[PDB]
Coordinates of N, CA, C and O in Angstrom, one line a residue:
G1 N 6.0 34.8 92.5 CA 6.8 35.7 91.7 C 6.1 35.9 90.4 O 5.3 35.1 89.9
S2 N 6.4 37.0 89.7 CA 5.8 37.3 88.4 C 6.7 36.9 87.2 O 6.3 36.4 86.2
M3 N 8.0 37.1 87.4 CA 9.0 36.8 86.4 C 9.6 35.4 86.6 O 10.6 35.2 87.1
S4 N 8.9 34.4 86.2 CA 9.3 33.0 86.3 C 9.6 32.7 87.8 O 8.7 32.2 88.5
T5 N 10.8 33.0 88.3 CA 11.1 32.7 89.7 C 12.2 33.6 90.2 O 13.1 34.0 89.4
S6 N 12.3 33.9 91.5 CA 13.4 34.7 92.0 C 13.9 34.1 93.3 O 13.4 34.4 94.4
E7 N 15.0 33.4 93.2 CA 15.6 32.8 94.5 C 14.5 32.0 95.3 O 14.1 32.4 96.3
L8 N 14.1 30.8 94.8 CA 13.1 30.0 95.5 C 13.7 29.1 96.5 O 14.3 28.1 96.2
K9 N 13.6 29.5 97.8 CA 14.3 28.6 98.9 C 13.2 28.0 99.8 O 12.0 28.3 99.6
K10 N 13.6 27.2 100.7 CA 12.6 26.6 101.6 C 12.8 27.0 103.1 O 13.7 27.9 103.3
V11 N 12.1 26.5 104.0 CA 12.3 26.9 105.4 C 11.8 25.7 106.3 O 11.0 24.9 105.9
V12 N 12.3 25.7 107.6 CA 11.9 24.6 108.5 C 10.7 25.2 109.4 O 10.4 26.3 109.3
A13 N 10.2 24.4 110.3 CA 9.1 24.8 111.2 C 9.6 24.7 112.7 O 10.2 23.7 113.0
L14 N 9.3 25.7 113.5 CA 9.7 25.6 114.9 C 8.5 25.3 115.8 O 8.7 24.6 116.8
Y15 N 7.3 25.6 115.4 CA 6.1 25.3 116.2 C 4.9 25.0 115.3 O 4.9 25.1 114.1
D16 N 3.8 24.5 115.9 CA 2.6 24.2 115.1 C 1.8 25.4 114.7 O 1.9 26.5 115.4
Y17 N 1.0 25.4 113.7 CA 0.2 26.5 113.3 C -0.9 26.1 112.3 O -0.8 26.4 111.1
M18 N -1.8 25.3 112.7 CA -2.9 24.8 111.8 C -3.7 26.0 111.2 O -3.6 27.1 111.8
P19 N -4.4 25.7 110.1 CA -5.2 26.8 109.5 C -6.3 27.2 110.4 O -6.9 26.4 111.1
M20 N -6.7 28.5 110.3 CA -7.9 29.0 111.1 C -9.1 29.1 110.2 O -10.2 28.7 110.5
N21 N -8.9 29.8 109.1 CA -10.1 30.0 108.2 C -9.8 29.4 106.8 O -10.5 28.5 106.3
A22 N -8.7 29.8 106.2 CA -8.3 29.2 104.8 C -6.9 29.7 104.4 O -6.1 29.0 103.9
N23 N -6.6 31.0 104.7 CA -5.3 31.5 104.3 C -4.2 30.8 105.0 O -3.2 30.3 104.4
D24 N -4.3 30.7 106.3 CA -3.2 30.1 107.1 C -2.8 28.7 106.5 O -3.6 28.0 106.0
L25 N -1.5 28.4 106.6 CA -1.1 27.0 106.0 C -0.9 26.0 107.2 O -0.6 26.4 108.3
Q26 N -1.1 24.8 106.9 CA -1.0 23.7 107.9 C 0.5 23.4 108.3 O 1.1 22.5 107.8
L27 N 1.1 24.3 109.1 CA 2.5 24.1 109.4 C 2.6 23.1 110.6 O 1.7 22.4 110.9
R28 N 3.8 23.0 111.2 CA 4.0 22.0 112.3 C 5.3 22.2 113.0 O 5.9 23.3 112.8
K29 N 5.8 21.3 113.7 CA 7.2 21.5 114.4 C 8.2 20.4 113.8 O 8.0 19.2 113.9
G30 N 9.3 20.9 113.3 CA 10.3 20.0 112.7 C 10.1 19.9 111.2 O 11.0 19.6 110.5
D31 N 8.9 20.1 110.7 CA 8.6 19.9 109.3 C 9.1 21.2 108.6 O 9.4 22.2 109.2
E32 N 9.3 21.1 107.3 CA 9.8 22.3 106.5 C 8.8 22.6 105.3 O 8.0 21.8 105.0
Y33 N 8.9 23.8 104.8 CA 8.0 24.2 103.7 C 8.7 24.7 102.5 O 9.9 24.7 102.4
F34 N 7.9 25.3 101.5 CA 8.6 25.9 100.3 C 8.2 27.4 100.3 O 7.0 27.7 100.4
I35 N 9.1 28.2 100.2 CA 8.8 29.7 100.1 C 8.5 30.2 98.7 O 9.3 30.0 97.8
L36 N 7.4 30.8 98.5 CA 7.1 31.4 97.2 C 7.0 32.9 97.3 O 7.1 33.6 96.3
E37 N 6.9 33.5 98.4 CA 6.8 35.0 98.6 C 8.0 35.5 99.4 O 8.9 34.7 99.7
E38 N 8.0 36.8 99.7 CA 9.1 37.4 100.5 C 8.8 38.8 100.7 O 9.7 39.7 100.6
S39 N 7.6 39.1 101.0 CA 7.2 40.6 101.1 C 7.9 41.2 102.3 O 8.9 40.7 102.8
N40 N 7.5 42.4 102.7 CA 8.2 43.0 103.8 C 7.6 42.7 105.2 O 7.6 43.5 106.1
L41 N 7.1 41.5 105.4 CA 6.5 41.1 106.7 C 6.9 39.7 107.1 O 7.2 38.9 106.3
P42 N 6.8 39.4 108.4 CA 7.2 38.0 108.9 C 6.3 37.0 108.3 O 6.7 35.9 108.0
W43 N 5.0 37.3 108.0 CA 4.1 36.3 107.4 C 4.4 36.2 105.9 O 4.5 37.2 105.2
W44 N 4.5 35.0 105.4 CA 4.8 34.8 104.0 C 3.6 34.0 103.3 O 2.6 33.8 103.8
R45 N 3.9 33.5 102.1 CA 2.9 32.7 101.3 C 3.6 31.5 100.8 O 3.9 31.4 99.6
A46 N 4.0 30.6 101.7 CA 4.8 29.4 101.3 C 3.9 28.2 101.3 O 2.8 28.2 101.8
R47 N 4.3 27.1 100.7 CA 3.4 25.9 100.6 C 4.1 24.8 101.5 O 5.2 24.8 101.7
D48 N 3.3 23.8 101.9 CA 3.8 22.7 102.7 C 4.0 21.4 101.8 O 4.1 21.5 100.6
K49 N 4.0 20.3 102.4 CA 4.2 19.0 101.7 C 2.9 18.6 100.9 O 3.0 17.8 100.0
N50 N 1.8 19.2 101.2 CA 0.5 18.9 100.5 C 0.4 19.8 99.3 O -0.7 19.8 98.7
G51 N 1.4 20.5 98.8 CA 1.2 21.3 97.6 C 0.2 22.4 97.9 O -0.4 22.9 97.0
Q52 N 0.0 22.8 99.1 CA -1.0 23.9 99.4 C -0.3 25.1 100.0 O 0.5 25.0 100.9
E53 N -0.7 26.3 99.4 CA 0.0 27.5 99.9 C -0.9 28.2 101.0 O -2.1 28.0 101.0
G54 N -0.3 28.9 101.9 CA -1.1 29.6 102.9 C -0.2 30.7 103.6 O 0.2 31.6 102.9
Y55 N 0.0 30.6 104.9 CA 0.9 31.7 105.5 C 1.9 31.0 106.4 O 1.7 30.1 107.1
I56 N 3.1 31.5 106.4 CA 4.2 31.0 107.3 C 4.9 32.2 108.0 O 5.7 32.8 107.4
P57 N 4.7 32.4 109.3 CA 5.3 33.4 110.0 C 6.9 33.2 110.0 O 7.3 32.1 110.2
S58 N 7.6 34.2 109.8 CA 9.1 34.1 109.7 C 9.6 33.5 111.0 O 10.5 32.6 111.0
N59 N 9.2 34.1 112.2 CA 9.7 33.5 113.5 C 9.4 32.1 113.6 O 10.2 31.3 114.1
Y60 N 8.2 31.7 113.2 CA 7.8 30.3 113.3 C 8.7 29.3 112.5 O 9.0 28.2 112.9
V61 N 9.1 29.8 111.3 CA 10.0 28.9 110.5 C 11.4 29.4 110.4 O 11.7 30.5 110.8
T62 N 12.3 28.6 109.8 CA 13.7 29.0 109.7 C 14.2 28.5 108.3 O 13.6 28.7 107.3
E63 N 15.4 27.9 108.3 CA 15.9 27.5 106.9 C 15.5 26.0 106.7 O 15.6 25.2 107.6
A64 N 15.1 25.6 105.5 CA 14.7 24.2 105.2 C 15.8 23.2 105.7 O 15.6 22.4 106.5
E65 N 17.0 23.3 105.1 CA 18.1 22.4 105.5 C 19.4 23.1 105.4 O 19.5 24.2 104.9
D66 N 20.5 22.4 105.8 CA 21.8 23.1 105.7 C 22.9 22.0 105.3 O 23.3 21.2 106.1
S67 N 23.2 22.0 104.0 CA 24.2 21.0 103.5 C 25.0 21.6 102.3 O 25.9 21.0 101.9

Protein backbone atom coordinates (compact mmCIF):
# COMPACT_ATOMS: atom_id res chain seq x y z
CA GLY A 1 0.00 0.00 0.00
CA SER A 2 1.14 3.63 -0.43
CA MET A 3 -0.89 5.36 2.32
CA SER A 4 0.44 3.58 5.46
CA THR A 5 -1.92 0.55 5.24
CA SER A 6 -5.40 -0.36 3.91
CA GLU A 7 -7.16 -3.33 5.60
CA LEU A 8 -4.15 -5.66 6.04
CA LYS A 9 -5.54 -9.21 6.45
CA LYS A 10 -3.99 -12.69 6.10
CA VAL A 11 -4.95 -15.93 4.28
CA VAL A 12 -4.52 -19.71 4.63
CA ALA A 13 -2.98 -22.13 2.06
CA LEU A 14 -4.83 -24.97 0.27
CA TYR A 15 -1.96 -26.51 -1.75
CA ASP A 16 1.84 -26.26 -2.18
CA TYR A 17 3.43 -23.67 -4.52
CA MET A 18 7.23 -23.39 -4.14
CA PRO A 19 9.03 -20.52 -5.94
CA MET A 20 10.04 -21.07 -9.59
CA ASN A 21 12.33 -18.10 -10.34
CA ALA A 22 12.06 -15.45 -7.59
CA ASN A 23 8.64 -13.72 -7.68
CA ASP A 24 6.65 -16.76 -6.55
CA LEU A 25 6.36 -17.13 -2.75
CA GLN A 26 7.14 -20.38 -0.86
CA LEU A 27 3.54 -21.32 0.04
CA ARG A 28 2.36 -24.75 1.28
CA LYS A 29 -0.75 -26.63 2.48
CA GLY A 30 -2.41 -25.69 5.79
CA ASP A 31 0.04 -22.80 6.34
CA GLU A 32 -1.19 -19.17 6.17
CA TYR A 33 0.42 -15.93 4.91
CA PHE A 34 0.13 -12.13 5.16
CA ILE A 35 -1.63 -10.13 2.42
CA LEU A 36 0.00 -6.85 1.34
CA GLU A 37 -1.67 -6.36 -2.08
CA GLU A 38 -5.19 -6.82 -3.53
CA SER A 39 -5.01 -5.94 -7.24
CA ASN A 40 -7.73 -7.08 -9.67
CA LEU A 41 -6.26 -10.60 -10.13
CA PRO A 42 -6.13 -13.95 -8.26
CA TRP A 43 -2.33 -13.61 -7.91
CA TRP A 44 -1.31 -11.30 -5.04
CA ARG A 45 1.89 -10.09 -3.36
CA ALA A 46 1.66 -11.51 0.18
CA ARG A 47 4.47 -12.70 2.50
CA ASP A 48 4.90 -16.02 4.35
CA LYS A 49 6.36 -16.80 7.80
CA ASN A 50 9.90 -16.07 6.49
CA GLY A 51 9.09 -12.33 6.09
CA GLN A 52 9.50 -12.83 2.31
CA GLU A 53 6.98 -11.44 -0.21
CA GLY A 54 6.16 -13.19 -3.52
CA TYR A 55 2.91 -14.38 -5.15
CA ILE A 56 -0.19 -16.04 -3.64
CA PRO A 57 -2.96 -17.24 -6.05
CA SER A 58 -6.42 -16.45 -4.58
CA ASN A 59 -7.75 -19.97 -5.29
CA TYR A 60 -4.66 -21.50 -3.64
CA VAL A 61 -5.18 -19.53 -0.37
CA THR A 62 -8.25 -18.56 1.67
CA GLU A 63 -8.76 -16.78 5.06
CA ALA A 64 -5.89 -16.88 7.61
CA GLU A 65 -8.08 -17.77 10.63
CA ASP A 66 -11.69 -17.44 11.88
CA SER A 67 -12.28 -16.35 15.50
